[PDB]
Structure formats: C-alpha cells, structure tokens
Design a protein around this ligand. Structure first.
Ligand SMILES: Nc1ncnc2c1ncn2[C@@H]1O[C@H](COP(=O)(O)OP(=O)(O)NP(=O)(O)O)[C@@H](O)[C@H]1O
Ligand SMILES: Nc1ncnc2c1ncn2[C@@H]1O[C@H](COP(=O)(O)OP(=O)(O)NP(=O)(O)O)[C@@H](O)[C@H]1O
Ligand SMILES: Nc1ncnc2c1ncn2[C@@H]1O[C@H](COP(=O)(O)OP(=O)(O)O)[C@@H](O)[C@H]1O
Ligand SMILES: [Mg+2]
Ligand SMILES: [Mg+2]
Lengths: 73, 303, 236, 314
C-alpha cells in the first residue's frame, strides 16, 4: 500500500532499496531481516530499526476492548 | 588477523606502519609475501622478519598432532554418554559420543526434543555432568525434565540437583545462538564441573529464517553456526547435540534433513526419528562408525 | 615415492607419483571420508601387513575425523591386532585442525617445516576444502577475487607443497550446490587447475557405493563400485 | 577465543570491508578506536561506532530455576478441567501454543476465553495479566467476550465464598467487566504485511505494557493463505514469524496462541515445528474433541470440551 518514500526512510536508503525493486511496505516486510542487511545496507538491529519503522507505518492501531464496546454504544 | 602491537613479542608499532606501507596489513600477508624483498625495501633486518615470520606461524598456525598421541589422549578423553534410552543407545553404539555434533532429524512431534531432554536428564543425573540446553523452539519444559528425572530417581533432592546441572539458555535468532556458543566457549577456555553436553533445539529454528532469496549470508551464518558447534564439540571435547527438522526432497520426493545440502555435511552422526502414540523409529541417517539404515524402535513412555 | 596405482590399485587401474592432486566430490555419507581412511590405512599400515608404511597428514578442516573409526578400520586390516601395532600404525598418522581458511592458510605455510623433517610423509588429506566456502564467499562481498582470495592463496601454497615434496593431495569437497555425474564447480579456478583426477561419490539406495573417477588430462570416465564395511572400503 | 566477524550482526558492507582490511575476529576490533577504525577500514564514523558497539555488547538460568519460574508463573487456565489437565494446568507461559482445527470448531472461542482467563488474579490461580488479541479473520466479537467475562466473574465469586474468606474477595475487587475489556488489546490485522508489521512492533508494545501475559494471533492462516500465492515466500515468512513469537513469549514471559485451519494443519510441513504446543480441535459425532497433537510435556491424548454459553467448559 504505502510507498517507502513516505514511511520515513532516507533518500540514500530509499535509493538503495530502489535498485533492488523495493518500493512498498509489503515488499520491504516480505524480505527477512537478514536479506535486508544487504539490500538496505546497515546491520541487524539497524534493519530492525527500519523494520520497526516500516512496520510503524503499516500496523493496526491498538484498540482496547473497552473502547470497542464504547464505540459500539 | 591484523598486524598490531601485542600480536607477537618484539613487534613494534613503528615497523607495523612500515609493513602497511607495502600493502602488508595481515598475518597471512606477512607470511605469504617474500620477506627478502620487503627487508631490503623497508630497511627492516632480514633476520628480524624471519624471526617475526616464525613466531607468527607458531602462534596462528595449528600444529600437527601425532596419531599415537591423539589415540592415547582420546582413549581417556572421549566418553560414550548414554542417552537413557536403551533402545537408542543400541543404535548409537552404546550412546552419544563426545567431540561429535549429533543431529536428531525428525518431523513435528517426532520426539526430537524428548530424546534431547532424556540425553540432558541422564547426563545431569546418571553421569553428574552439567548440560547446556540451548533451546530455540521453546521445546524444553522444566516439568518434563523433572518428570524424566522422577522416573529415574525418587529422591527429592537428587532431582533438584540434576536439574541444577542443566543450564537452559534461550536463543531465538542466529546471532543470539552464536553469542551463546561463543560465550560458552570462552567459559570453557577460562576454567566446578564444566559443560559436557550442549543441546541445540533446534538449529533449523534459527537458521531457516536466514535461508531464502539470492543472499548467501544465511549459508555463511549456518556454516559459522556449524563451525561454532564443531569447535565446541571437537576442540572442547563435549557431546554437542543438535535438532533438525525434516523436509521432503523437491526432486526425489524423499525425506532429507532440512537447511539445504550445505548443512547435510555438518553433523558427524545423524539420527532420523519418524513415527511408525509414543513409539518411534530411530534410523541412523548418517554415521561415521555404523552402517546407515539400521532402525530400532524407540518408545517415549518407557523413558 | 609410491605410484598412485601402488596406493589403491582399484581406483587407479591405469599407470597414474611425484605431485598428483586429486579431488573427492559427492554428497554426505557417500564414502568420501571413508575412502580417505582406506587411503590412510594402506599408507600407515606396515609393509608386513600390506600397507605402504608411509606417513599421512590429515587436514581436518571439517572437524569430522573419527579417530576411533580409523582405529576400527586399522585393527580389522591387521592380521594380528595389538595395542602396540595400532600405536605404531597411528604413529605415522598426523592430524591438523583448521578452523578457518586463514587458519588453514597459515597452517599450510607452517607445514613446510614438517615436510622438510618428515620425508616419508607422502599422502596429504584436506577434508574438506569446501568447509569455508560460504564463510569466504560472503566475507568477500560481490568481488570474486575477495571471496576466493584466501582459498586461492591456499591452492598456490598447496601446489607448492605438493610439487616440492612430491606429495599426493586427496583434498575432498562437498556437493554444496545443485546440478549445472552431478558436479557443479564452485571453488577458485586456482584450485580447479590443480585437480588431475576428480572422483564423484554417489550412494545407491544400501551399503554399496559407486565412485566415478575422471582423469582431467585425458577426460576418461571409469565407474568404480565399493562397499563400506567394518574393514573400511572393499571394491566390487 | 576468537569470534569470527561473520558470527556478529554487523553490516554486510562493513563486514566485507573489515575482512578486506584483514580484520576477521572480534578481538582484533576490540583494541581499535572508533575513529581510527574508520581510517583503517573506510567505513563511516557511525558505522565504525556501531561496529565496535556490536562486538563489545556480545540469562543462563538452570533448569531448577526454570522449574520454579514455571511453577510461579502459572498456566493460563482454559476454564475446562479436561483441557487444562492435558496441558499441565492450562496454556503454558514462555511458550507457543497452536490451536489447529476445521472452521466452526471453536478456535476463536478458546482465544476469547483465554483473554479473560489471563486477567484472573494470581490469588485465584491466574496470572493476573493482560491479553493481546491480534485478530486476522475478524472473528473477535466483543459482545461474546462480555458474556465470557461476566461468566468468569460469576464463577470466581462462587469460589469466593465457599472458602468463607474475604482475602480472595479482595482480589476480585478489580476483576470487574471494565478492567477485563480494558486489558484486551485488539489488533485487527487485515493483510499478512499488516500482521507481520504488528509482530515486529510487538516487542516494543509489550515493553510499554509489561502486564501483557497472552498474545493471540487468530489466525496465522488467513493472512498467509490469501493474497499470497508464493509458497516459497510463505514458508519463509511463517518460519521467520515462528521465531518472533517464541522469542516474544519467552523474553516477555507470556503465552502465544496461534490458530490454523485444517487442510493435517495447513501452512506447510515446516510450520509443524513452529509451535511448541499443538492442539487440534476437531469433531466426532456432533461432539467437540480436543486432541493434543504435539507437546514436549504431555503425551498425545484427546479430551472432551463443550462450548456452552457460559464459555469454554468441560
Ligand atoms: N511426559 C510424556 N510422556 C509421554 N509422551 C510424551 C510426554 N511428553 C511428550 N510426549 C510425546 O512427545 C511428543 C512430542 O515430542 P517432541 O520431542 O516435542 O517432538 P519434537 O520433534 O521435538 N517436536 P518439535 O518441537 O517440532 O521438535 C508428543 O506428541 C507426545 O507423544
Ligand atoms: N563400520 C561401518 N560398517 C559399515 N558401514 C559403515 C561403517 N562406518 C561407516 N559406514 C558407512 O560409511 C559411510 C561413509 O561415511 P563418510 O565417509 O563419513 O561419508 P562422507 O562422504 O565423508 N560424508 P561427509 O562427512 O560430509 O564427508 C557412512 O555414511 C556409513 O553409512
Ligand atoms: N453463544 C454461543 N452458543 C453456542 N455456540 C456457540 C456460541 N458462540 C460460538 N459458538 C460455537 O463456537 C464455534 C466458534 O468457532 P470459531 O473458532 O469462533 O470460528 P472458526 O472455527 O471459523 O474460527 C461455532 O462453531 C459455534 O457453533
Ligand atoms: Mg521440539
Ligand atoms: Mg566425511
């Protein structure tokens, strides 16, 4: 859905991804953390920082079940 | 490694810069390169480099071990650690072997963790030797280890003492597992009874996410994990036991160990566990001392 | 020295001494290491038994040498097995453990001292040269030179070691990559040029093994069948 | 001891540069300064600082200690005596449990029941934790959980006076419906990417919410069996997700519930190794049966359970 330009990644990192045909959050997430260490450069726990950053743009919003009951009222 | 002060006595930093100036930065660079040419070029004494080459070789190159010395040493060093399963120790020629990476390949619910716990439980109690159970799938359950020990021994304290020898360390990524083995290897180097059995359950759990895609870094991490396991086994003389998943071949359509063909050369001994509820078949898929193909019944409830 | 056909007549049926480098290839359990033990046995056993009584150097880069297995093979091949004879036979066997390619490379340079002091050391084992392939390949990045830099230096050192002391290098490699006689070369071209006879180990599905040996100088293929028992390797 | 640089989680670009500069063991880089490392390797200051940091950074609890942890950290009861008995007392913490079954068997009913059962106070035998519900099929019905919560309160208050003691009744002063629902964290993951994204954000989520003692992924089948035709990718994602869940449960000391759909359970053969505990909910003559297909602590067995309006009962 969302592109990786709008996730929050840098131009250098996006360009390094664009060379490997990665432009969406789906493509970035489908790759394992290890294979992103060469596609995106960087290291483990640095790609995980990206993996948490890319996830933070395409993850559901937590809804407390009281809020769901409250919003259903 | 890299030529630096403290790598060898008499190696001053002043010449280390001089060696760098001629593209000699590593130990292998200094040993491989013709020292007579460098001695004239850098002004360093030829006798110094020759002495420097010998000390670097005497420090970083392994030394041949005579077979007679190794045979006598391994005679009183290698120990056939019983797995607690009499119907499997018969397959393993009286049990596990220290200094070897034993692999227990099987499907889900094939008893891979269960036999590993019995190996841990028997070594902890029967042989009074500490065990390092590196679990990656969460297979180890301390109630099961106590349950196995309760059958073997009815003493309240001896069950706790045997459990005290089993060190459970959780590692779920490859680097965590590599850290545990390296931390263990340093612990053994610096030494109370040390760790005699290392159980990894499972190697395929952490290595399989690495595999996939055009990247070969997963294979390197697998082989580095393989190298760490074999350094623990052969160098430190401990019976390293690993757990592997089963997979069906793409072409031949037969059961083979997971983690590709590269990992298939890693273990010295491999046990295949396949269901024939507690009865299992233990087939010696790979062995360095016994024919491959012999299979014996293994029942979980007897343990 | 001794002729290759004088080491194992079955594999080297033709006349094929003084600097031969041979490659063992095949999947796991196919008898690569067990063939080395048979080669080790026929060299370290006494001339009275039938062996060549020459020293053997084993570079166990794969950490898979089972000494008790070699003792098991040696005692079966001995007509009168004794603790003294098994000691003397293993007294001609030398084992080196190399945990990395650079460790292997530095070891090979240090071996130059031993061969100058061990003239009878004729047969050399390097099981397995493919142990550090993935470690070296990834550490080399995308540059092929960097990936094979350590292996190529080993191969040049090996060629120097073999051709200076008239050695026989039975270096073994593992079929770690899929098909292109299933053989996909993956080591450095420096190593490939040194191989004179590459023998492919295959397992027939039980205890019977097939060994296809090709002399790269003449490109002649011959199939050998051998069974692995308690005595080691017997050719059918 | 020398630790190879490949074994470290270094940047592959940096590791190749380190090897090309001759550095191949961790102990070589320890003596090197960060800025001087950049000069000798060519990596940036940040990468050199991160490279040395990774090497320098790189519990060993005995089984007796883990036995006390498993005893103190009680099992999440399923409100069914038969099911809890063949699980040691309920869903085990620090472990991954899989609920496989055909559609309509009650996989989500167990999950929604387990969400309430986590919030049972410790003095009542529960873990007094919170539940994270990573819903994928949209089967999480709040109204049904309210019935499950109210019935759980009624059951706990029935045991709160047979003992003739108010000491337990103190614990039940917060178990009201308000807290039960407010402690159920609901993540509606639609696609597998969104589900996979939430898994990566879960360790950070549970650091903030240390009270979470249950993570429910209901289910791991639907996202990966829709809008994903690549089986090679699927088995990589599930295998990678397998380690994320088990690491999450062990590090945060909670229980992970995964629900499959019978196809044998789906998601390939390698997925059978993912979950330490596997429960197969199937049918037999219009009576629900709970089969323990795989467990490292309990032998394979089948127990009878019924999904009454009161909840997941015997
Ligand atoms: N206490 C017990 N008594 C009898 N049988 C048991 C007991 N605990 C476990 N089992 C059996 O062990 C089986 C699973 O054993 P296990 O060792 O976990 O297999 P596994 O191959 O390790 N599965 P995995 O976690 O993927 O590796 C169960 O299905 C039971 O049949
Ligand atoms: N005492 C024995 N009797 C009969 N067969 C045996 C005996 N010992 C070993 N074998 C068989 O000999 C085969 C050859 O073993 P081995 O030489 O180690 O294989 P390999 O090619 O070296 N695999 P690898 O370790 O990766 O090099 C084994 O797979 C066993 O099936
Ligand atoms: N209030 C209720 N009364 C009776 N039966 C119910 C009630 N709620 C749910 N059930 C039963 O529980 C099952 C729920 O299965 P579930 O796991 O939630 O869906 P799926 O199996 O499709 O994932 C249904 O088959 C239904 O028969
Ligand atoms: Mg297991
Ligand atoms: Mg071998």
């Amino acid at each position: 859905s969302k592109k990786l330009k709008r996730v929050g990644l840098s131009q250098e990192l996006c360009d390094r991804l664009s060379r490997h045909q990665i432009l969406t959050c789906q493509d970035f997430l489908c790759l394992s953390p290890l294979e992103l260490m060469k596609v995106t450069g960087l290291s483990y726990r640095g790609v995980h920082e990206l993996l948490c950053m890319v996830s933070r743009a395409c993850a559901p919003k937590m809804q407390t079940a009281y809020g769901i009951k409250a919003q259903r009222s | 490694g890299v030529l630096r002060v403290g790598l060898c006595p008499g190696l001053t930093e002043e010449m280390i810069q001089l060696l760098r100036s001629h593209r000699i930065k590593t130990v292998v660079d200094l040993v491989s390169a013709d020292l007579e040419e460098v001695a004239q070029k850098c002004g360093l004494s030829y006798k110094a480099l020759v002495a420097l080459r010998r000390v670097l070789l005497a420090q970083f190159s392994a030394f041949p071990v005579n077979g007679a010395d190794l045979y006598e040493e391994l005679k009183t060093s290698t120990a056939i650690l019983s797995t607690g399963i009499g119907s499997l120790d018969k397959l393993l020629d009286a049990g596990l072997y220290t200094g070897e990476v034993t692999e227990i390949v099987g499907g889900p619910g094939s008893g891979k963790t269960q036999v590993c716990l019995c190996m841990a439980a028997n070594v902890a109690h029967g042989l009074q030797q500490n065990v390092l159970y590196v679990d990656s799938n969460g297979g180890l359950t301390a109630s099961r280890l106590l349950q196995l020990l309760q059958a073997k021994t009815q003493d309240e304290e001896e069950q706790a003492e045997a459990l005290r020898r089993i060190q459970v360390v959780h590692a779920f990524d490859i680097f965590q597992m590599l850290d545990v083995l390296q931390e263990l290897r340093g612990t053994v180097a610096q030494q109370s009874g040390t760790v005699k059995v290392v159980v990894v359950d499972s190697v395929t759990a952490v290595v399989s996410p690495l595999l996939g895609g055009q990247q070969r870094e997963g294979l390197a991490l697998m082989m580095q994990l393989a190298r760490e396991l074999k350094t623990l086994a052969r160098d430190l003389g401990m019976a390293v036991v690993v757990t592997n998943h089963i997979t069906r071949d793409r072409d031949s359509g037969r059961l083979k160990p997971a983690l590709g063909r590269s990992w298939s050369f890693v273990p010295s001994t491999r046990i295949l566990l396949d269901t024939i509820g507690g009865r299992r078949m233990a087939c010696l898929a790979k062995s360095s001392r016994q024919p491959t193909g012999f299979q014996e019944m293994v029942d979980i409830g007897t343990w | 020295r001794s002729s290759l056909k004088e080491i194992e007549p079955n594999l080297f049926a033709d006349e094929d001494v003084h600097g031969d480098i041979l490659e063992f290839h095949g999947p796991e359990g196919t008898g690569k290491t067990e063939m080395l033990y048979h080669l080790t046995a026929r060299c370290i056993l006494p001339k009275s038994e039938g062996g060549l009584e020459v020293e053997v150097l084993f570079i166990d880069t794969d950490y898979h040498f089972d000494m008790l297995r070699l003792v098991t093979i040696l005692e079966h091949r001995l007509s009168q097995s004794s603790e003294e004879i098994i000691k003397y036979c293993l007294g001609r066997f030398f084992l080196v453990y190399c945990s990395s390619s650079t460790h292997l490379l530095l070891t090979l340079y240090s071996l130059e001292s031993m061969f100058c002091s061990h003239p009878s050391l004729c047969l050399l084992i390097l099981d397995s040269l493919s142990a550090f392939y993935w470690i070296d390949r990834v550490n080399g990045g995308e540059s092929v030179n960097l990936q094979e830099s350590t292996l190529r230096k080993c191969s040049q050192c090996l060629e120097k070691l073999v051709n200076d002391y008239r050695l026989v290098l039975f270096a073994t490699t593992q079929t770690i990559m899929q098909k292109a006689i299933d053989y996909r070369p993956y080591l450095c071209k420096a190593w490939q040029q040194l191989v004179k006879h590459r023998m492919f180990f295959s397992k027939q599905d039980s205890n019977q093994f097939s060994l296809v040996s090709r002399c790269l100088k003449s490109n002649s293929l011959k199939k050998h069948f051998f069974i692995i028992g308690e005595s080691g390797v017997e050719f059918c | 001891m020398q630790r190879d640089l490949v074994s470290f989680p270094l940047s592959p670009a940096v590791r190749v540069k380190l090897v090309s500069a001759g550095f191949q063991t961790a102990e070589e880089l320890l003596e090197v300064k960060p800025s001087e490392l950049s000069k000798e390797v060519g990596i940036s200051k940040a990468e050199a600082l991160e490279t040395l940091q990774i090497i320098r950074r790189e519990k060993k609890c005995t089984a007796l200690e883990l036995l006390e942890q498993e005893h103190t950290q009680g099992f999440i009861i399923t409100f069914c005596s038969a099911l809890d008995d063949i699980l040691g007392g309920g869903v085990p913490l620090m472990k991954t449990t899989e609920i496989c079954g055909a559609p309509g068997v009650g996989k989500t009913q167990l999950c929604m029941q387990l969400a309430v059962d986590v919030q049972i106070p410790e003095c009542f035998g529960g873990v007094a934790g919170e539940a994270v519900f990573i819903d994928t099929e949209g089967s999480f019905m709040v109204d049904r959980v309210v019935d499950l919560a109210t019935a759980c309160i009624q059951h706990l208050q029935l045991i709160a006076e047979k003992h003739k003691g108010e000491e337990h009744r103190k614990a039940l002063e917060d178990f009201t419906l308000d807290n039960i629902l407010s402690h159920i964290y609901y993540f509606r993951c639609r696609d597998y990417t969104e589900l996979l994204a939430q898994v990566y954000l879960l360790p950070d989520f549970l650091s903030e919410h240390s009270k979470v003692r249950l993570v429910i992924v209901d289910g791991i089948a639907f996202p990966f069996r829709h809008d994903l035709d690549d089986l090679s990718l699927r088995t990589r994602l599930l295998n990678g997700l397998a380690q994320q869940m088990i690491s999450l449960a062990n590090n945060h000391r909670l229980a992970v519930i995964l629900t499959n759909q019978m196809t044998v359970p789906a998601l390939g053969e390698s997925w059978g190794h993912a979950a330490t505990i596997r429960l197969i909910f199937h049918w037999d003559r219009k009576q629900r049966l709970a089969t323990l297909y795989k467990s490292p602590s309990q032998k394979e067995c089948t127990v009878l359970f019924q999904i009454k309006p009161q909840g997941f009962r015997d």
